[PDB]
Design a protein around this ligand. Structure first.
Ligand SMILES: CC(=O)N[C@@H]1[C@@H](O)[C@H](O)[C@@H](CO)O[C@H]1O
Ligand SMILES: CC(=O)N[C@@H]1[C@@H](O)[C@H](O)[C@@H](CO)O[C@H]1O
Ligand SMILES: CC(=O)N[C@@H]1[C@@H](O)[C@H](O)[C@@H](CO)O[C@H]1O
Ligand SMILES: CC(=O)N[C@@H]1[C@@H](O)[C@H](O)[C@@H](CO)O[C@H]1O
Length: 359
């Protein structure tokens, strides 16, 4: 993969239309847009997400376990790879799949409550400590690998656990067999075990993704690249691994690419403070030898609302941030999401700061 990496992170929900002729024209416009952008890589959504409700119910490829909304991942992928000049990473949830109800869900232990529960503001994750979950998610990745050709896998940011998770019964068994003492409440407040417990969960998530990678590689071959989205806080505030179960050094060792969600508004940073936040992030990265060479900084192109009506970030603002990254010595970056239907971000404003081939 030739340097630098410039990544468009693309949902196919926009492309989908019940009218097949319209969907055809949509795909054509998308392929041309990516070609015109002249960048290196597309992270391409393989799952449907029409409602943004943190749970995958349908996918864009034929498979054994979930409804196929439309057979379009493979179709878009091969055209992007041959007409638009990009590598394609299949973007897949790690855990948040609407599978058999008897499969174990991740739960958290609420303060003051005895029974573990599912938090409504979190991804609706299956538990990585349930071996049948591992098998069935494995089957989904195998079905993707068998039907479509691509260059890499992007593991979704839903591979995370808080310091009150996973409280499910199979997770409890896993902790017990690993030597952890007492209840989840006791472990997480034990000075001598809570850091080890955090690391155990981080390793469990990573090991699960590496199992999935191995299964895809068994089908498509060894050259398949891996990437995983990491939240910004585990990078800039490493103690936060306690409530993310993500470790930046672990990512850098385990994956070809660590896709950092360099998204200040997502993190609640004020508009007037966002640039400084990004500078501090890049400083932290540059202080770890060679980290920047295996990291992609992923900027946000929408400002997401709990309300649900997301708001676009101006093309000028996105270009400004891209310029900021370059000026601070960061050459690998991209953005999420892209909206071909409205030329948002505006290709003519973004290319000068995004395409190495510009002017
Ligand atoms: C935070 C996040 O993932 N937001 C995405 C949004 O950018 C995208 O346009 C929409 C359509 O797929 O789905 C949402 O989930
Ligand atoms: C509110 C809802 O139905 N689902 C949300 C989803 O929108 C969000 O992307 C995810 C991660 O915060 O958490 C889920 O619980
Ligand atoms: C069958 C099932 O899992 N139902 C849960 C529900 O009990 C919970 O209140 C809600 C919180 O988001 O998430 C649902 O998935
Ligand atoms: C507020 C803060 O800075 N960090 C908290 C952490 O102390 C807490 O244990 C965790 C609970 O899931 O939520 C984080 O946001």
């Amino acid at each position: 993969e030739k340097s630098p990496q410039r990544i468009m992170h693309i949902d196919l929900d926009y492309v989908y239309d019940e009218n097949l002729q319209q969907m055809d024209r949509n795909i054509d416009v998308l392929i041309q847009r990516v070609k015109d952008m002249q960048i290196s890589t597309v992270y391409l959504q393989a799952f449907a997400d029409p409602d943004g409700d943190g749970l995958v119910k349908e996918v864009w490829f034929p498979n054994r376990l979930l409804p196929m909304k439309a057979d379009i991942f493979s179709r878009v992928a091969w055209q992007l790879r041959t007409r638009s000049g990009v590598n394609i990473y299949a973007w897949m949830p790690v855990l948040s799949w609407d599978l058999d109800p008897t499969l174990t869900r991740v739960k958290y232990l609420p303060t003051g409550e005895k029974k573990a529960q599912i938090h409504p503001e979190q991804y609706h994750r299956l538990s990585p400590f349930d071996d049948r979950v591992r098998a069935q998610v494995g089957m989904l990745y195998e079905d993707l690998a068998g039907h479509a050709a691509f260059d890499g896998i992007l593991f979704h940011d839903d591979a995370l656990l808080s310091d009150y998770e996973d409280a499910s019964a199979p997770a409890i068994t896993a902790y017990q067999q690993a030597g952890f003492s007492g209840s989840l409440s006791e472990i997480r407040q034990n000075p001598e075990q809570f850091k080890q417990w955090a690391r155990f969960k981080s390793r469990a998530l990573t090991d699960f993704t590496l199992e999935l990678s191995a299964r895809v590689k068994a089908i498509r071959g060894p050259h398949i690249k891996t990437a995983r989205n990491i939240f910004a806080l585990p990078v800039i505030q490493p103690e936060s691994e306690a409530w993310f179960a993500q470790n930046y050094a672990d990512f850098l060792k385990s994956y070809d690419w660590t896709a950092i969600m360099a998204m200040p508004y997502l993190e609640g940073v004020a508009e007037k403070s966002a640039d400084q936040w990004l500078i501090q992030l890049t400083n932290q990265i540059k202080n770890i030898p060679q980290a920047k060479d295996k990291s992609i900084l992923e900027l946000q192109a929408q400002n997401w609302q709990k309300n649900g009506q997301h708001q676009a970030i101006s093309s000028q603002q996105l270009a400004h941030w891209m310029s900021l990254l370059q000026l601070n010595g960061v050459k690998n970056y991209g953005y999420y999401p892209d909206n071909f239907l409205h030329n948002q971000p505006e290709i003519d404003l973004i290319r000068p700061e995004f395409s190495t081939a510009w002017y």
